Amino acid sequence: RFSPYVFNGGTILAIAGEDFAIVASDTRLSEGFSIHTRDSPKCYKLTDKTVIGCSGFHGDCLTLTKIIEARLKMYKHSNNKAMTTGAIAAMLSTILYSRRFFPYYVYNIIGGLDEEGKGAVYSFDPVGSYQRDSFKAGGSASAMLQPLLDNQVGFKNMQNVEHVPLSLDRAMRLVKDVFISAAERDVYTGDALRICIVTKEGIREETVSLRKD
């Protein structure tokens, strides 16, 4: 019969500061050898300095997003008080644990800022589960990019001589550099790159285009 599983995911990269975060993503979305669309990110601004991205399938991605947004509205109505990141982190999991019967899935990540004046990023598995991050790349191209990303951004491996502390500017240079490189190693990366930069002033977006061939 008809499929109960179709791929569509891209590639994303979430980078955590200690007072900022950026979540960057390709616009190219593909499956296999035919191209679904040459545009659209899977990173979205949930608001209030929470940025979210759901990689796996477009059909699932829109639906989760819409649905979360009502639970936040309802909550505030129920008495003035808002979900923290952590709250949201539990909320996604329950949904997934339900969906363990459902045959379509997604690999979700949430990022934002705490009131500890630093980033928190939590990442979920497609069955439920959560873990604390420092940095996460998600999607297809992730597996290849990440050790190198971990080392260049991090310096927390047992295979580097020194540390340096993050800078925003420096984080931006690294991010573009990884993506431009990713593109001639995948057909799931390409076209353009959408950067969500998260600060305590508010949420800014930057776009730069990449190669295609």
């Binding site: 659209s40 059909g59 459902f102």
Partner: protein, 218 residues
Amino acid sequence: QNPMVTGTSVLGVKFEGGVVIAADMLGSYGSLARFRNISRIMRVNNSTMLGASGDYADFQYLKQVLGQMVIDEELLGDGHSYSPRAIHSWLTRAMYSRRSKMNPLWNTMVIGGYADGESFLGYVDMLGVAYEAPSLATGYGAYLAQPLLREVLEKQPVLSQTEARDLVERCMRVLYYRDARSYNRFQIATVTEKGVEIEGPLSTETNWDIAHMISGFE
């Protein structure tokens, strides 16, 4: 669910003054031409147009629910409210639920229209993936025709040079020649900003050298 009597190749585009849509008129049952000269055109309201491809039985079923939408409420039910961005969402939800039962439909539909200032052209599939793009083609047309259309519609100033019908007319001739699971007749419909217009029964035009090189009959 499973194909029965099916239709393929529904092409569409957006242009300055409107959106243009074209579709052949065929109901094939594998390869037997059960129906020749069959519509695929549902006017929605008068200011939006749905072109549908996929199972023809399923199409009929969907037309009625759409029909209920405007014969209800104090004022018309697709009057003051219900914009094309809304009509697109409403449709997507309906595929989504079927797929969740895994008792699915089998159509790919284009909802085309005008909003009030902006062109609306939005896609829905059996997969249920929803997008807006300036150019769409279904079926065989999705693979073959859409790169020919894309040269014109990925270059935005060149769009602005002309009313689109000619690109459409041309593509459809190449399409009829290469594929004989397609029929010589087609209908073309244009939704302008305030009006809607259907040009009825046309047949493909006979090219110069291309006619010698390749014919449309088996």
